[PDB]
Amino acid sequence: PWAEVCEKFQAALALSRVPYKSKYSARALLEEVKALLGPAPPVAQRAVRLAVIEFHLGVNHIDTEELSAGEEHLVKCLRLLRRYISLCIQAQNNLGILWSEREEIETAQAYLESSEALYNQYMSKRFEKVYTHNLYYLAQVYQHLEMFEKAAHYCHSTLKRQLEHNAYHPIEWAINAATLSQFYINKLCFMEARHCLSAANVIFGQELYHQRKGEIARCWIKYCLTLMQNAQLSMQDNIGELDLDKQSELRALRKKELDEEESIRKKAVQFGTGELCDAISAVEEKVSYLRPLDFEEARELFLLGQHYVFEAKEFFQIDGYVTDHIEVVQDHSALFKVLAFFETDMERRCKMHKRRIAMLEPLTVDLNPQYYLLVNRQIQFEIAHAYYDMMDLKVAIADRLRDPDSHIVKKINNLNKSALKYYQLFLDSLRDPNKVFPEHIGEDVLRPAMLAKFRVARLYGKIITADPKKELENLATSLEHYKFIVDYCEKHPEAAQEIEVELELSKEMVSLLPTKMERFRTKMALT
Structure with missing residues (x-):
């Protein structure tokens, strides 16, 4: 009856290949195979013939994770095959993956750990690919326990194997690699970390199709901002005016050999052999800046070249988070002018003031109880009007000859003080200022x-x-x-x-x- 059995398989297969489209005569295949079970008659051969549908049976009884019967049958069959070659890994993974949502995560680990162990012990689609799924599912487990170092090893290694095959998708490359970046930012290994972001630019080059650029442009920001702000080691105000007293040592022989070992690991990512090399060529052409003492135009160009997609993301934000990037650009442009150590220009302060008016109108638009948004805006009020304070100090010290009318500037200072007292009076009225918002005591003391x-x-x-x-x-x-x-x-x-x-x-x-x-x-x- 083997010809009949094979025909019944192949007949049932297509309908499986599809209110739920299934479980529908998927029991008829069950009935037929179980009819085969009785007068099945070596014995091992017969048993091997069995567990196929049983696999599928457990698969069938998903019932959108609200079931259990499939769980029972699956564990039965798993114990069978345990006593009884890739079937074990093909099953154990999915058996675990349900328990992942059951949050017995530590136990679920052992399953995947055993799987990879079996891989290592052993030494066509399955042969060239199932390795993938275990590795991917592995990393997202770690997130909670925060061995980010360990997770990064896998993610980086996984992307390499992913390059063997022709499967490539823009989200799976970009939205992963970009998020991987911030890890090294904290470790402050810029010289190494550039390569990931920089190479992330061609894959996407080859709905979401537009809004994915957002994270792409965002990751650029953090790169620049740390590099500028690290330079604040030596402040002219609190450190000696002479700068770079110690040898600059921009190029050092000892340092490069150590870099190469790290570089070799980075070099391994390149595959395609020449197009990726040209990608990395353009990469380096924009890596053209490392560690500056003439930095001014370089960093401003950094901003401007990415300011394009900064604006683009502002377009791709619905009026809610646009303020966030606007104020970030505000702060950064200010910081460019500041660390650009020279006195006579207030232009970016004035332009920040206009942008600040621009972000103030949404208060008229939104009088919502936006407490900490108001707190933040009052904070950069303090900061900008401290800029007023310091430029006042500078001008007053610069008063060599008789003072012209700077009393207008002094009244500007006074109205700045007025704006401030309005802000901390808003805080007051929150506390003791009004009929709608009075309080017993200043119980909230610290902030x-x-x-x-x-x-x-x-x-x-x-x-x-x-x-x-x-x-x-x-x-x-x-x-x-x-x-x-x-x-x-x-x-x-x-x-x-x-x-x-x-x-x-x-x-x-x-x-x-x-x-x-x-x-x-x-x-x-x-x-």
């Missing part, structure tokens, strides 16, 4: 205390020229400082940052004394 310290410095910045105003501001500063004394020394939370506490202790003595001085002026006036 508003650091904000209040900033405004303390601002009150110290009340130093202006006006005569009837000076007197009332003497009183205002004294009273504000006394408020602050109450806020901290007498709240008795004692969880307040003691470093600050002592800073405002210095400030409180520094306030006691010239309040006495102002008394002296007033009473010399009383004389």
Whole structure:
């Protein structure tokens, strides 16, 4: 009856190859094979003939993971074949994968560990490919336990084997490789890490088809920003003005040999033998910048060349996260001008101010309880108006001859102070300012205390020229400082940052004394 059996197989196969499209006469094949079971009659040969449908049977009873009967039959057959060549790995993987959602992850590990062990012990689609699925499923397990080093080894090794075959897809290459980047960023191995991102550019070059560029452009940002900010080792303000006192040593013989060993591992990724080499050629042409002392145009061009797709992502964001990239570009452009160590230009400050107006209108659009968005914007208000403070210091020191009208700039400073007091008065009204939002005590002390310290410095910045105003501001500063004394020394939370506490202790003595001085002026006036 073997011809009949084979015909029944091949007849059943196609319908399997498809309200659920199946389980439908998939029991008729069951009935026929089980009819074959009884008068099956060596014995091992007969048994081998069996487990095929049984495999499929367990496969059939998925029932969208709400079942169990398939589980039972599968484990039965697995015990059979255990006592009884690639079938074991073909099954054990899927048996485990359900328990993965059952979250017995540690136990599930042992299965895949055994599978790879069997691979290693042993030494056409299965022969050239099932290795793949185990490796892929392996990495996402590690994420929770955070051996990212170990996971990276697999992911990187997996991509190489993936290159043997013609299977390639843009998401599976890009969205994986790009995310792999940040790992080395933390390890600060830029010289090694460039290659991944840089090579990630041609595969995608050969819906999502548009929005995938977003992560691509984002990863560029983190590359630049760390490289600039690491240079902040030596600040002209707190470190000697002479720079590069120690030998620059841009090119070192000892360093290159060590690099080559790492480079050799990187070299292994290239395959295609020449087109990938040309890809890496263009790679290096833009790797053209490593470690600079003339950096200015190079880094600005970094931004600009990626500013293109920065804008593109802004297009591909619906008004919600556009602010995020806008303010990131804001900060970075500011940092370019800053670390570009020269005085006379305020242009990027002014342009940031315009962009800041631009991001302020959404407050009118959205008066939602966007607390920390408001906190953030007030923070860069502090920062920009500190830029005002410092440029004021610079101009005032630059006052060689008689001062022209910079009192307009001083009033700009005053309205900056007004904007600030509006912001921390928003914070007030949140706390004690209004009928809708009053509070018992300043129970929340830490973050508003650091904000209040900033405004303390601002009150110290009340130093202006006006005569009837000076007197009332003497009183205002004294009273504000006394408020602050109450806020901290007498709240008795004692969880307040003691470093600050002592800073405002210095400030409180520094306030006691010239309040006495102002008394002296007033009473010399009383004389």
